[PDB]
PDB file of all heavy atoms in Angstrom:
ATOM      1  N   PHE A   1     -14.537   5.883   9.140  1.00 43.52           N
ATOM      2  CA  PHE A   1     -14.227   5.788  10.552  1.00 43.52           C
ATOM      3  C   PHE A   1     -14.597   4.411  11.092  1.00 43.52           C
ATOM      4  O   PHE A   1     -15.748   3.976  10.995  1.00 43.52           O
ATOM      5  CB  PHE A   1     -14.993   6.869  11.320  1.00 43.52           C
ATOM      6  CG  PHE A   1     -14.279   8.217  11.367  1.00 43.52           C
ATOM      7  CD1 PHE A   1     -13.322   8.537  10.416  1.00 43.52           C
ATOM      8  CD2 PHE A   1     -14.557   9.132  12.365  1.00 43.52           C
ATOM      9  CE1 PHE A   1     -12.665   9.744  10.469  1.00 43.52           C
ATOM     10  CE2 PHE A   1     -13.917  10.331  12.419  1.00 43.52           C
ATOM     11  CZ  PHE A   1     -12.959  10.637  11.466  1.00 43.52           C
ATOM     12  N   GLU A   2     -13.603   3.735  11.665  1.00 43.94           N
ATOM     13  CA  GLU A   2     -13.689   2.389  12.237  1.00 43.94           C
ATOM     14  C   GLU A   2     -13.818   1.294  11.192  1.00 43.94           C
ATOM     15  O   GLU A   2     -13.971   0.137  11.557  1.00 43.94           O
ATOM     16  CB  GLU A   2     -14.883   2.269  13.218  1.00 43.94           C
ATOM     17  CG  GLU A   2     -14.863   3.323  14.327  1.00 43.94           C
ATOM     18  CD  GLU A   2     -16.020   3.178  15.282  1.00 43.94           C
ATOM     19  OE1 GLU A   2     -16.807   2.216  15.127  1.00 43.94           O
ATOM     20  OE2 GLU A   2     -16.135   4.028  16.216  1.00 43.94           O
ATOM     21  N   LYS A   3     -13.754   1.632   9.908  1.00 42.43           N
ATOM     22  CA  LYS A   3     -13.840   0.640   8.845  1.00 42.43           C
ATOM     23  C   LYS A   3     -12.443   0.279   8.326  1.00 42.43           C
ATOM     24  O   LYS A   3     -11.447   0.946   8.612  1.00 42.43           O
ATOM     25  CB  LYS A   3     -14.704   1.176   7.698  1.00 42.43           C
ATOM     26  CG  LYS A   3     -16.195   1.006   7.910  1.00 42.43           C
ATOM     27  CD  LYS A   3     -16.939   2.321   7.836  1.00 42.43           C
ATOM     28  CE  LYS A   3     -18.436   2.123   7.996  1.00 42.43           C
ATOM     29  NZ  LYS A   3     -19.179   3.402   7.999  1.00 42.43           N
ATOM     30  N   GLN A   4     -12.389  -0.797   7.556  1.00 39.38           N
ATOM     31  CA  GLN A   4     -11.141  -1.335   7.024  1.00 39.38           C
ATOM     32  C   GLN A   4     -10.981  -0.930   5.565  1.00 39.38           C
ATOM     33  O   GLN A   4     -11.934  -0.957   4.785  1.00 39.38           O
ATOM     34  CB  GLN A   4     -11.098  -2.864   7.157  1.00 39.38           C
ATOM     35  CG  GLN A   4     -11.122  -3.359   8.577  1.00 39.38           C
ATOM     36  CD  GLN A   4     -11.047  -4.872   8.676  1.00 39.38           C
ATOM     37  OE1 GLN A   4     -11.108  -5.568   7.673  1.00 39.38           O
ATOM     38  NE2 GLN A   4     -10.899  -5.373   9.888  1.00 39.38           N
ATOM     39  N   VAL A   5      -9.743  -0.584   5.202  1.00 40.85           N
ATOM     40  CA  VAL A   5      -9.397  -0.241   3.827  1.00 40.85           C
ATOM     41  C   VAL A   5      -8.406  -1.293   3.311  1.00 40.85           C
ATOM     42  O   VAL A   5      -7.272  -1.336   3.786  1.00 40.85           O
ATOM     43  CB  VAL A   5      -8.806   1.172   3.727  1.00 40.85           C
ATOM     44  CG1 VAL A   5      -8.355   1.453   2.300  1.00 40.85           C
ATOM     45  CG2 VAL A   5      -9.820   2.205   4.186  1.00 40.85           C
ATOM     46  N   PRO A   6      -8.801  -2.156   2.369  1.00 43.76           N
ATOM     47  CA  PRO A   6      -7.864  -3.147   1.853  1.00 43.76           C
ATOM     48  C   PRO A   6      -6.786  -2.527   0.998  1.00 43.76           C
ATOM     49  O   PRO A   6      -6.923  -1.419   0.462  1.00 43.76           O
ATOM     50  CB  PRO A   6      -8.757  -4.065   1.030  1.00 43.76           C
ATOM     51  CG  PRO A   6      -9.883  -3.206   0.577  1.00 43.76           C
ATOM     52  CD  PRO A   6     -10.116  -2.234   1.710  1.00 43.76           C
ATOM     53  N   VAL A   7      -5.659  -3.257   0.876  1.00 42.10           N
ATOM     54  CA  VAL A   7      -4.551  -2.767   0.058  1.00 42.10           C
ATOM     55  C   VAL A   7      -4.958  -2.595  -1.391  1.00 42.10           C
ATOM     56  O   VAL A   7      -4.431  -1.744  -2.093  1.00 42.10           O
ATOM     57  CB  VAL A   7      -3.340  -3.744   0.196  1.00 42.10           C
ATOM     58  CG1 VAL A   7      -3.651  -5.068  -0.471  1.00 42.10           C
ATOM     59  CG2 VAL A   7      -2.093  -3.112  -0.406  1.00 42.10           C
ATOM     60  N   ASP A   8      -5.917  -3.393  -1.856  1.00 43.91           N
ATOM     61  CA  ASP A   8      -6.369  -3.312  -3.256  1.00 43.91           C
ATOM     62  C   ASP A   8      -7.020  -1.962  -3.549  1.00 43.91           C
ATOM     63  O   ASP A   8      -7.041  -1.548  -4.709  1.00 43.91           O
ATOM     64  CB  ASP A   8      -7.341  -4.435  -3.550  1.00 43.91           C
ATOM     65  CG  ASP A   8      -7.960  -4.323  -4.949  1.00 43.91           C
ATOM     66  OD1 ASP A   8      -7.200  -4.477  -5.927  1.00 43.91           O
ATOM     67  OD2 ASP A   8      -9.173  -4.082  -5.053  1.00 43.91           O
ATOM     68  N   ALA A   9      -7.563  -1.285  -2.541  1.00 44.67           N
ATOM     69  CA  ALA A   9      -8.162   0.029  -2.766  1.00 44.67           C
ATOM     70  C   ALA A   9      -7.120   1.085  -3.030  1.00 44.67           C
ATOM     71  O   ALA A   9      -7.451   2.175  -3.524  1.00 44.67           O
ATOM     72  CB  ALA A   9      -9.018   0.433  -1.568  1.00 44.67           C
ATOM     73  N   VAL A  10      -5.841   0.828  -2.679  1.00 42.68           N
ATOM     74  CA  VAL A  10      -4.759   1.785  -2.870  1.00 42.68           C
ATOM     75  C   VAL A  10      -3.913   1.435  -4.079  1.00 42.68           C
ATOM     76  O   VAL A  10      -3.690   2.287  -4.948  1.00 42.68           O
ATOM     77  CB  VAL A  10      -3.899   1.864  -1.594  1.00 42.68           C
ATOM     78  CG1 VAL A  10      -2.815   2.909  -1.740  1.00 42.68           C
ATOM     79  CG2 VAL A  10      -4.776   2.183  -0.384  1.00 42.68           C
ATOM     80  N   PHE A  11      -3.429   0.208  -4.143  1.00 41.30           N
ATOM     81  CA  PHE A  11      -2.562  -0.238  -5.222  1.00 41.30           C
ATOM     82  C   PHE A  11      -3.267  -1.321  -6.035  1.00 41.30           C
ATOM     83  O   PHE A  11      -4.316  -1.806  -5.696  1.00 41.30           O
ATOM     84  CB  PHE A  11      -1.222  -0.757  -4.677  1.00 41.30           C
ATOM     85  CG  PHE A  11      -0.498   0.239  -3.800  1.00 41.30           C
ATOM     86  CD1 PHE A  11      -0.442   0.031  -2.433  1.00 41.30           C
ATOM     87  CD2 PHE A  11       0.113   1.336  -4.338  1.00 41.30           C
ATOM     88  CE1 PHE A  11       0.226   0.918  -1.621  1.00 41.30           C
ATOM     89  CE2 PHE A  11       0.780   2.249  -3.537  1.00 41.30           C
ATOM     90  CZ  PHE A  11       0.830   2.043  -2.169  1.00 41.30           C
ATOM     91  N   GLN A  12      -2.621  -1.692  -7.149  1.00 45.50           N
ATOM     92  CA  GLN A  12      -3.136  -2.753  -8.004  1.00 45.50           C
ATOM     93  C   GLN A  12      -1.927  -3.470  -8.650  1.00 45.50           C
ATOM     94  O   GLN A  12      -0.777  -3.153  -8.396  1.00 45.50           O
ATOM     95  CB  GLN A  12      -4.084  -2.195  -9.074  1.00 45.50           C
ATOM     96  CG  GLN A  12      -3.404  -1.315 -10.098  1.00 45.50           C
ATOM     97  CD  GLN A  12      -4.410  -0.654 -11.036  1.00 45.50           C
ATOM     98  OE1 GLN A  12      -5.412  -0.092 -10.595  1.00 45.50           O
ATOM     99  NE2 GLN A  12      -4.142  -0.732 -12.337  1.00 45.50           N
ATOM    100  N   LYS A  13      -2.262  -4.452  -9.509  1.00 47.37           N
ATOM    101  CA  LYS A  13      -1.226  -5.227 -10.150  1.00 47.37           C
ATOM    102  C   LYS A  13      -0.608  -4.482 -11.315  1.00 47.37           C
ATOM    103  O   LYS A  13      -1.297  -3.730 -12.029  1.00 47.37           O
ATOM    104  CB  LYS A  13      -1.819  -6.557 -10.648  1.00 47.37           C
ATOM    105  CG  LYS A  13      -0.822  -7.500 -11.304  1.00 47.37           C
ATOM    106  CD  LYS A  13      -1.490  -8.776 -11.755  1.00 47.37           C
ATOM    107  CE  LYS A  13      -0.530  -9.679 -12.549  1.00 47.37           C
ATOM    108  NZ  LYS A  13      -1.157 -10.964 -12.917  1.00 47.37           N
ATOM    109  N   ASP A  14       0.692  -4.644 -11.503  1.00 47.11           N
ATOM    110  CA  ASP A  14       1.478  -4.135 -12.630  1.00 47.11           C
ATOM    111  C   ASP A  14       1.806  -2.656 -12.529  1.00 47.11           C
ATOM    112  O   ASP A  14       2.320  -2.079 -13.506  1.00 47.11           O
ATOM    113  CB  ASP A  14       0.792  -4.384 -13.975  1.00 47.11           C
ATOM    114  CG  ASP A  14       0.613  -5.862 -14.279  1.00 47.11           C
ATOM    115  OD1 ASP A  14       1.482  -6.656 -13.861  1.00 47.11           O
ATOM    116  OD2 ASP A  14      -0.375  -6.226 -14.943  1.00 47.11           O
ATOM    117  N   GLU A  15       1.542  -1.994 -11.411  1.00 46.32           N
ATOM    118  CA  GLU A  15       1.857  -0.592 -11.258  1.00 46.32           C
ATOM    119  C   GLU A  15       3.148  -0.390 -10.475  1.00 46.32           C
ATOM    120  O   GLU A  15       3.565  -1.262  -9.691  1.00 46.32           O
ATOM    121  CB  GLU A  15       0.709   0.161 -10.574  1.00 46.32           C
ATOM    122  CG  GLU A  15       0.505  -0.178  -9.115  1.00 46.32           C
ATOM    123  CD  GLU A  15      -0.548   0.678  -8.440  1.00 46.32           C
ATOM    124  OE1 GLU A  15      -1.369   1.255  -9.182  1.00 46.32           O
ATOM    125  OE2 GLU A  15      -0.540   0.773  -7.207  1.00 46.32           O
ATOM    126  N   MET A  16       3.793   0.734 -10.710  1.00 46.03           N
ATOM    127  CA  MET A  16       5.036   1.079 -10.035  1.00 46.03           C
ATOM    128  C   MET A  16       4.750   1.802  -8.732  1.00 46.03           C
ATOM    129  O   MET A  16       3.929   2.731  -8.709  1.00 46.03           O
ATOM    130  CB  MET A  16       5.910   1.962 -10.958  1.00 46.03           C
ATOM    131  CG  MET A  16       6.446   1.246 -12.164  1.00 46.03           C
ATOM    132  SD  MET A  16       7.670   0.001 -11.756  1.00 46.03           S
ATOM    133  CE  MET A  16       8.249  -0.469 -13.400  1.00 46.03           C
ATOM    134  N   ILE A  17       5.412   1.395  -7.665  1.00 46.85           N
ATOM    135  CA  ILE A  17       5.247   2.005  -6.345  1.00 46.85           C
ATOM    136  C   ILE A  17       6.616   2.330  -5.773  1.00 46.85           C
ATOM    137  O   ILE A  17       7.648   1.826  -6.238  1.00 46.85           O
ATOM    138  CB  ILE A  17       4.478   1.076  -5.363  1.00 46.85           C
ATOM    139  CG1 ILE A  17       5.235  -0.229  -5.132  1.00 46.85           C
ATOM    140  CG2 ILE A  17       3.093   0.797  -5.911  1.00 46.85           C
ATOM    141  CD1 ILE A  17       4.638  -1.075  -4.036  1.00 46.85           C
ATOM    142  N   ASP A  18       6.611   3.213  -4.783  1.00 47.01           N
ATOM    143  CA  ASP A  18       7.790   3.549  -4.029  1.00 47.01           C
ATOM    144  C   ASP A  18       7.724   2.912  -2.644  1.00 47.01           C
ATOM    145  O   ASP A  18       6.664   2.915  -2.007  1.00 47.01           O
ATOM    146  CB  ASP A  18       7.948   5.072  -3.894  1.00 47.01           C
ATOM    147  CG  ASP A  18       7.892   5.775  -5.242  1.00 47.01           C
ATOM    148  OD1 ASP A  18       8.291   5.170  -6.251  1.00 47.01           O
ATOM    149  OD2 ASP A  18       7.472   6.959  -5.286  1.00 47.01           O
ATOM    150  N   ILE A  19       8.851   2.372  -2.184  1.00 49.81           N
ATOM    151  CA  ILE A  19       8.943   1.715  -0.889  1.00 49.81           C
ATOM    152  C   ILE A  19       9.809   2.576   0.014  1.00 49.81           C
ATOM    153  O   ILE A  19      10.918   2.953  -0.373  1.00 49.81           O
ATOM    154  CB  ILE A  19       9.494   0.274  -1.016  1.00 49.81           C
ATOM    155  CG1 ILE A  19       8.608  -0.536  -1.952  1.00 49.81           C
ATOM    156  CG2 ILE A  19       9.567  -0.385   0.356  1.00 49.81           C
ATOM    157  CD1 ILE A  19       9.101  -1.955  -2.175  1.00 49.81           C
ATOM    158  N   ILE A  20       9.318   2.868   1.207  1.00 46.82           N
ATOM    159  CA  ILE A  20       9.996   3.733   2.158  1.00 46.82           C
ATOM    160  C   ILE A  20      10.192   2.926   3.441  1.00 46.82           C
ATOM    161  O   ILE A  20       9.235   2.275   3.921  1.00 46.82           O
ATOM    162  CB  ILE A  20       9.238   5.028   2.426  1.00 46.82           C
ATOM    163  CG1 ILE A  20       8.983   5.767   1.122  1.00 46.82           C
ATOM    164  CG2 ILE A  20      10.012   5.920   3.401  1.00 46.82           C
ATOM    165  CD1 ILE A  20       7.971   6.899   1.241  1.00 46.82           C
ATOM    166  N   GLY A  21      11.365   2.982   4.026  1.00 48.53           N
ATOM    167  CA  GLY A  21      11.657   2.281   5.255  1.00 48.53           C
ATOM    168  C   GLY A  21      13.050   2.588   5.742  1.00 48.53           C
ATOM    169  O   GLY A  21      13.761   3.423   5.167  1.00 48.53           O
ATOM    170  N   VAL A  22      13.424   1.896   6.819  1.00 47.01           N
ATOM    171  CA  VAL A  22      14.740   2.048   7.440  1.00 47.01           C
ATOM    172  C   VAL A  22      15.560   0.823   7.106  1.00 47.01           C
ATOM    173  O   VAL A  22      15.112  -0.321   7.323  1.00 47.01           O
ATOM    174  CB  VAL A  22      14.628   2.265   8.956  1.00 47.01           C
ATOM    175  CG1 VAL A  22      15.998   2.408   9.568  1.00 47.01           C
ATOM    176  CG2 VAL A  22      13.760   3.477   9.258  1.00 47.01           C
ATOM    177  N   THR A  23      16.776   1.027   6.616  1.00 47.30           N
ATOM    178  CA  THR A  23      17.630  -0.064   6.181  1.00 47.30           C
ATOM    179  C   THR A  23      18.077  -0.904   7.376  1.00 47.30           C
ATOM    180  O   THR A  23      17.970  -0.505   8.540  1.00 47.30           O
ATOM    181  CB  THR A  23      18.858   0.472   5.430  1.00 47.30           C
ATOM    182  OG1 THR A  23      19.613   1.333   6.287  1.00 47.30           O
ATOM    183  CG2 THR A  23      18.438   1.241   4.198  1.00 47.30           C
ATOM    184  N   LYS A  24      18.645  -2.078   7.066  1.00 45.94           N
ATOM    185  CA  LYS A  24      19.145  -2.944   8.109  1.00 45.94           C
ATOM    186  C   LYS A  24      20.299  -2.270   8.868  1.00 45.94           C
ATOM    187  O   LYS A  24      21.188  -1.685   8.261  1.00 45.94           O
ATOM    188  CB  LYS A  24      19.619  -4.286   7.499  1.00 45.94           C
ATOM    189  CG  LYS A  24      18.559  -4.989   6.687  1.00 45.94           C
ATOM    190  CD  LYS A  24      19.116  -6.219   5.974  1.00 45.94           C
ATOM    191  CE  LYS A  24      19.581  -7.296   6.963  1.00 45.94           C
ATOM    192  NZ  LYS A  24      20.011  -8.533   6.278  1.00 45.94           N
ATOM    193  N   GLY A  25      20.288  -2.403  10.184  1.00 45.27           N
ATOM    194  CA  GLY A  25      21.319  -1.797  10.994  1.00 45.27           C
ATOM    195  C   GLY A  25      22.578  -2.641  11.032  1.00 45.27           C
ATOM    196  O   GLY A  25      22.535  -3.880  10.978  1.00 45.27           O
TER     197      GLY A  25
END
């Protein structure tokens, strides 16, 4: 609570991830 979570705590180098978003209109 009220602390920061860096991206490195979730992902790392050389791993496969899924990207979710809304395409260009």
Side-chain angles (χ1 to χ4, degrees):
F1 274 22
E2 305 181 4
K3 278 123 177 176
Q4 296 182 354
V5 176
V7 68
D8 175 67
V10 182
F11 305 108
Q12 68 186 48
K13 183 180 174 177
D14 297 328
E15 69 175 20
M16 292 291 188
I17 62 171
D18 306 332
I19 303 179
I20 304 167
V22 180
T23 60
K24 304 174 65 175

